[PDB]
Enzyme design. Structure first.
Site, PDB file in Angstrom:
ATOM      1  N   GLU A   8      -3.483  15.572   2.299  1.00  0.00           N
ATOM      2  CA  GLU A   8      -4.070  14.715   1.268  1.00  0.00           C
ATOM      3  C   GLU A   8      -4.458  15.467  -0.009  1.00  0.00           C
ATOM      4  OE1 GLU A   8      -3.706  11.612   1.685  1.00  0.00           O
ATOM      5  OE2 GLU A   8      -3.159  11.774   3.802  1.00  0.00           O
ATOM      6  N   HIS A  35      -0.088  11.881  -6.147  1.00  0.00           N
ATOM      7  CA  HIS A  35      -0.656  12.018  -4.811  1.00  0.00           C
ATOM      8  C   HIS A  35       0.448  11.942  -3.755  1.00  0.00           C
ATOM      9  CE1 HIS A  35      -3.495  11.649  -1.435  1.00  0.00           C
ATOM     10  NE2 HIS A  35      -2.602  10.799  -0.959  1.00  0.00           N
ATOM     11  N   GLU A  36       1.275  10.905  -3.861  1.00  0.00           N
ATOM     12  CA  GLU A  36       2.362  10.667  -2.920  1.00  0.00           C
ATOM     13  C   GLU A  36       3.432  11.761  -2.971  1.00  0.00           C
ATOM     14  OE1 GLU A  36       1.949   8.544  -0.674  1.00  0.00           O
ATOM     15  OE2 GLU A  36       0.345   7.314  -1.539  1.00  0.00           O
ATOM     16  N   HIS A  50       0.833  -1.192   0.000  1.00  0.00           N
ATOM     17  CA  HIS A  50       0.000   0.000   0.000  1.00  0.00           C
ATOM     18  C   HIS A  50       0.876   1.253   0.000  1.00  0.00           C
ATOM     19  CE1 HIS A  50      -3.987   1.926   0.625  1.00  0.00           C
ATOM     20  NE2 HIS A  50      -3.207   2.910   1.034  1.00  0.00           N
ATOM     21  N   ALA A  51       0.719   2.074  -1.040  1.00  0.00           N
ATOM     22  CA  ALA A  51       1.589   3.229  -1.300  1.00  0.00           C
ATOM     23  C   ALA A  51       1.612   4.240  -0.159  1.00  0.00           C
ATOM     24  CB  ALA A  51       1.183   3.914  -2.600  1.00  0.00           C
ATOM     25  N   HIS A  58       2.591  14.759  -0.875  1.00  0.00           N
ATOM     26  CA  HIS A  58       3.036  14.601   0.509  1.00  0.00           C
ATOM     27  C   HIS A  58       4.502  15.002   0.645  1.00  0.00           C
ATOM     28  CE1 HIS A  58      -0.581  12.796   2.020  1.00  0.00           C
ATOM     29  NE2 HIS A  58      -0.486  11.711   1.271  1.00  0.00           N
ATOM     30  N   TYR A 114      -9.557  12.180   3.950  1.00  0.00           N
ATOM     31  CA  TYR A 114      -9.812  12.004   2.518  1.00  0.00           C
ATOM     32  C   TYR A 114     -11.124  12.652   2.088  1.00  0.00           C
ATOM     33  CZ  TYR A 114      -6.024   8.636   3.078  1.00  0.00           C
ATOM     34  OH  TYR A 114      -4.831   8.031   3.392  1.00  0.00           O
ATOM     35  N   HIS A 164      -6.739   1.021   5.616  1.00  0.00           N
ATOM     36  CA  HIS A 164      -6.758   2.076   6.625  1.00  0.00           C
ATOM     37  C   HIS A 164      -7.396   1.635   7.939  1.00  0.00           C
ATOM     38  CE1 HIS A 164      -6.178   4.048   2.762  1.00  0.00           C
ATOM     39  NE2 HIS A 164      -5.652   5.068   3.415  1.00  0.00           N
TER      40      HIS A 164
HETATM   41  C1  LIG Z   1      -2.524   5.430  -1.750  1.00  0.00           C
HETATM   42  C2  LIG Z   1      -2.913   6.185  -0.477  1.00  0.00           C
HETATM   43  N1  LIG Z   1      -2.190   5.604   0.668  1.00  0.00           N
HETATM   44  C3  LIG Z   1      -1.498   6.499   1.631  1.00  0.00           C
HETATM   45  C4  LIG Z   1      -1.838   6.063   3.072  1.00  0.00           C
HETATM   46  C5  LIG Z   1      -1.109   6.910   4.115  1.00  0.00           C
HETATM   47  C6  LIG Z   1      -0.503   6.133   5.295  1.00  0.00           C
HETATM   48  C7  LIG Z   1       0.303   5.007   5.092  1.00  0.00           C
HETATM   49  C8  LIG Z   1       0.858   4.335   6.179  1.00  0.00           C
HETATM   50  C9  LIG Z   1       0.613   4.797   7.476  1.00  0.00           C
HETATM   51  C10 LIG Z   1      -0.185   5.928   7.686  1.00  0.00           C
HETATM   52  C11 LIG Z   1      -0.743   6.596   6.595  1.00  0.00           C
HETATM   53  C12 LIG Z   1      -1.738   8.004   1.359  1.00  0.00           C
HETATM   54  O1  LIG Z   1      -0.888   8.565   0.653  1.00  0.00           O
HETATM   55  O2  LIG Z   1      -2.724   8.572   1.866  1.00  0.00           O
HETATM   56  C13 LIG Z   1      -4.414   5.997  -0.221  1.00  0.00           C
HETATM   57  O3  LIG Z   1      -4.771   5.060   0.490  1.00  0.00           O
HETATM   58  N2  LIG Z   1      -5.366   6.781  -0.760  1.00  0.00           N
HETATM   59  C14 LIG Z   1      -6.815   6.604  -0.467  1.00  0.00           C
HETATM   60  C15 LIG Z   1      -7.277   5.138  -0.679  1.00  0.00           C
HETATM   61  O4  LIG Z   1      -6.778   4.499  -1.627  1.00  0.00           O
HETATM   62  O5  LIG Z   1      -8.088   4.665   0.145  1.00  0.00           O
HETATM   63  C16 LIG Z   1      -7.522   7.561  -1.434  1.00  0.00           C
HETATM   64  C17 LIG Z   1      -6.499   8.692  -1.605  1.00  0.00           C
HETATM   65  C18 LIG Z   1      -6.630   9.326  -3.000  1.00  0.00           C
HETATM   66  C19 LIG Z   1      -5.569   8.679  -3.912  1.00  0.00           C
HETATM   67  C20 LIG Z   1      -4.870   7.605  -3.072  1.00  0.00           C
HETATM   68  C21 LIG Z   1      -5.137   7.983  -1.599  1.00  0.00           C
HETATM   69 ZN   LIG Z   2      -2.155  10.625   1.027  1.00  0.00          ZN
END
Ligand SMILES: C[C@H](N[C@H](CCc1ccccc1)C(=O)O)C(=O)N1[C@H](C(=O)O)C[C@@H]2CCC[C@@H]21
Ligand SMILES: [Zn+2]
Ligand SMILES: *[C@@H]1O[C@H](CO)[C@@H](O[C@@H]2O[C@H](CO)[C@@H](O[C@@H]3O[C@H](CO[C@H]4O[C@H](CO)[C@@H](O)[C@H](O)[C@@H]4O)[C@@H](O)[C@H](O[C@H]4O[C@H](CO[C@@H]5O[C@H](CO)[C@@H](O)[C@H](O)[C@@H]5O)[C@@H](O)[C@H](O)[C@@H]4O)[C@@H]3O)[C@H](O)[C@H]2NC(C)=O)[C@H](O)[C@H]1NC(C)=O
Ligand SMILES: *[C@@H]1O[C@H](CO)[C@@H](O)[C@H](O)[C@H]1NC(C)=O
Ligand SMILES: *[C@@H]1O[C@H](CO)[C@@H](O)[C@H](O)[C@H]1NC(C)=O
Length: 598
Positions: A379, A351-352, A321-322, A355, A491, A481
């Site tokens: 976000e 997206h990343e 998970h990114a 951050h 989000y 999550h």
């Molecule tokens: C890929 C992304 N994952 C990371 C999870 C953040 C994280 C990772 C590890 C510990 C605490 C927080 C993020 O960059 O927010 C993510 O889950 N999502 C969300 C999702 O896929 O549920 C929707 C958000 C819009 C595009 C992708 C974003």
């Molecule tokens: Zn994010």
């Protein structure tokens, strides 16, 4: 007296911040090693460093009572001391903290190690969510195949950690109360510094909801024509395994079968990316180029040296998970992404990197201020860029979209495609936290926890499981999550505010004029806009130094979270879709689901 003490407090804070950054660097390194390489040895190491930092935080929180900080003149000093009172989980007794850490890593590692058997070959049982199961969910139009992978995944990622999740809810509640919040819901909400924040979101959500109902109605209509009425009913919730996503949070993967005008172009640049020999490295370099073109900060050498941008080819377990990581030194920022060469992955890269940019913009701030203005702001940054990269305008510039004619019907396809991500996501995001809030607040008895989940998914999103579930199942932790204890309201906030940022950035770039048909909001490209970049610099460099309304004000002069911008963006779609549903006598709304047995 207070004048001399305030001078001393300032020196105390400057030193303590540096010490906290350094101690947190060590914890973060340990967490990174575990996330990149899940082993019992790395778990133990990560959790032991965390317990050590928690112990230090207790001493720090205790030491704040020695200063008369509430009496000080400087708002800045008071804000910093207040940040230091916020222990969170670190308020827990030593043994309870250790137990919570063990519980959290048990849940995240279970999720990361989920493997299912091939639908067509029960010999092959090494299929992970990323990329194997997600590939099938996104591509297959065989409803029984989709149902199989849905059930296998939810049983392994969700149900298997019920008892661990229960203990986590207990300890999260204990931690919240030790911090004198009512529950973990209030602890999470404290991050938004606004006692009316829940109501504000209810109000915004209520304004967008009718548009969601129209999209839902149309998609259900189109799925009936594809799968038939035996699979999809006219009046019931949509069977969620047909929406091209494991959690039905985004529906863009089924755009090719639900698009308003199937004879007109639908943007899907994955094939061209592959044809042109794109790699994960190139995707990240392009993202870096976008940020630098706006006169923002280039990625440091540490990022390129230490990031993991492709899934490792040894047999090791990791969290795919990114995610983006700040190490609280200088220029030590990293991404860990199991990058694939697709259109959606290009958006995730941006997206990343949003951050990362935030990390770099506020690294000069004292430690306590080295975070988003609120969690939704962090976000939103990358998604603002993704909005412009997704435009036909931008995709043509980079040669990924060829022979595209942008008539009214192509415009509707593109708006609809965007809505399948952006509007569809809103009720999803709301329910992830509504559910956890209700458990945290003690509003649902343990015996009703699973049907409480599906009830919300029904009420707000109008979707349901492909098969009958019951309290013998526990489906919530099948979402990353939830297993990983990451608050989700960020989000929902992001998806609203990113349109506020995008609209303003587009006006600054000269790319949007509401009275000019040549400059529509849905075809705005902010690439190369130093004017838009400047606004981001003003806001992002602030970190958490000021309450979030001041950060928004630094960007565009506004101080209020508003649904006006997202509504403005999709207004042409709304007008068209309302007419189209009426034209086609499309049923809107849904009956209560029968898929969760109480
Ligand atoms: C890929 C992304 N994952 C990371 C999870 C953040 C994280 C990772 C590890 C510990 C605490 C927080 C993020 O960059 O927010 C993510 O889950 N999502 C969300 C999702 O896929 O549920 C929707 C958000 C819009 C595009 C992708 C974003
Ligand atoms: Zn994010
Ligand atoms: C969450 O909320 C909790 C309350 O529900 C809160 O817990 C309270 O924290 C208080 C500390 O801020 C603490 O107050 C102390 O109480 C001591 C005696 O308490 C005992 O007897 C009580 C029976 O009547 C019981 O209720 C208790 O359980 C205890 O058994 C006092 O000895 C103590 O006093 C000292 O400190 C005060 C405070 O000094 C302040 O700072 C300067 C001094 O440097 C002063 O100039 C200034 O004016 C200010 O007052 C001094 O005035 C005094 O001289 C003593 O040195 C103090 O009052 C309380 O006991 C505790 N529990 C309860 C049930 O009230 C948590 O702290 C909250 N948690 C978080 C994270 O915020
Ligand atoms: C994973 O961790 C083990 C020890 O826990 C270590 O020996 C190994 O080098 C790591 N693997 C990789 C690929 O980094
Ligand atoms: C680039 O940013 C710097 C400071 O960050 C600013 O001084 C400069 O004017 C910017 N470039 C342009 C063209 O605005």
């Amino acid at each position: 007296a207070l004048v001399k003490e305030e001078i001393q407090a300032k020196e105390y804070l400057e030193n303590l911040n540096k010490e906290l950054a350094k101690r947190t660097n060590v914890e973060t390194e340990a967490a990174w090693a575990y996330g990149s390489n899940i082993t019992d040895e790395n778990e133990k190491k990560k959790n032991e460093i965390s317990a050590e930092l928690a112990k230090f935080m207790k001493e720090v929180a205790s030491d704040t009572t020695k200063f008369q900080w509430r009496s000080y003149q400087s708002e800045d000093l008071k804000r910093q001391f207040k940040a230091l009172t916020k222990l969170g989980y670190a308020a827990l007794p030593e043994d309870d903290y250790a137990e919570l850490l063990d519980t959290l890593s048990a849940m995240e590692s279970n999720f990361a190690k989920v493997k299912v058997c091939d639908y067509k070959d029960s010999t092959k049982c090494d299929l992970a969510l990323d990329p194997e199961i997600e590939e099938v969910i996104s591509k297959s139009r065989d409803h029984e195949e989709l149902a199989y992978y849905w059930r296998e995944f939810y049983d392994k990622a969700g149900t298997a950690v019920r008892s661990q999740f229960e203990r986590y809810v207990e300890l999260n509640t204990k931690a919240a109360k030790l911090n004198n919040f009512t529950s973990g819901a209030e602890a999470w909400l404290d991050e938004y510094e606004d006692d009316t924040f829940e109501q504000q979101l209810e109000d915004i959500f209520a304004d967008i909801r009718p548009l969601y109902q129209q999209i839902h109605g149309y998609v259900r209509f189109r799925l009936r024509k594809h799968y038939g009425d035996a699979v999809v009913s006219e009046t019931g919730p949509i069977p969620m395994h047909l929406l091209g996503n494991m959690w039905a949070q985004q529906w863009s993967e089924i755009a090719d079968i639900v698009s308003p005008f199937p004879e007109k172009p639908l943007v899907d640049v994955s094939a061209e990316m592959e044809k042109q020999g794109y790699t994960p490295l190139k995707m990240f370099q392009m993202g870096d180029d976008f940020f630098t073109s706006m006169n923002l900060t280039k990625l440091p050498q540490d990022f390129w040296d230490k990031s993991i941008i492709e899934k490792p080819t040894d047999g090791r377990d990791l969290v795919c998970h990114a995610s983006a990581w700040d190490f609280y030194l200088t220029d030590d920022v990293r991404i860990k992404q199991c990058t694939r060469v697709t259109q959606d992955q290009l958006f995730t890269v941006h997206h990343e990197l949003g951050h990362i940019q935030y990390f770099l913009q506020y690294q000069h701030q004292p430690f306590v201020y080295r975070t988003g203005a609120n969690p939704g702001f962090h976000e939103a940054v990358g998604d603002v860029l993704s909005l412009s990269v997704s435009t036909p305008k931008h995709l043509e510039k980079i040669g990924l979209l060829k022979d595209y004619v942008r008539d009214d019907e192509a415009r509707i396809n593109q708006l609809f495609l965007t809505a399948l991500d952006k509007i569809v996501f809103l009720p999803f995001a709301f329910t992830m936290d509504k559910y956890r809030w209700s458990l945290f607040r003690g509003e649902v008895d343990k015996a009703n926890w699973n049907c409480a989940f599906w009830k919300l998914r029904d009420e707000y999103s109008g979707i349901e499981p492909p098969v009958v579930r019951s309290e013998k199942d526990f489906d919530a932790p099948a979402k990353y999550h939830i297993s990983a204890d990451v608050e989700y309201l960020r989000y929902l906030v992001s998806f609203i505010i990113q349109f506020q940022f995008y609209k303003s950035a587009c006006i600054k770039a000269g790319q949007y004029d509401p009275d000019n048909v040549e400059l529509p909001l849905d075809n705005c490209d902010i690439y190369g806009s130093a004017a838009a970049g400047a606004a981001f610099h003003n806001m992002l460099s602030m970190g958490a130094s000021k309450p979030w309304p001041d950060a928004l004000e630094a960007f565009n002069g506004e101080r209020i979270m508003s649904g006006k911008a997202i509504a403005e963006y999709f207004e042409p779609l709304r007008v068209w879709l309302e007419a189209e549903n009426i034209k086609n006598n499309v049923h809107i709304g849904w009956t209560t689901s029968n898929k969760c047995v109480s």
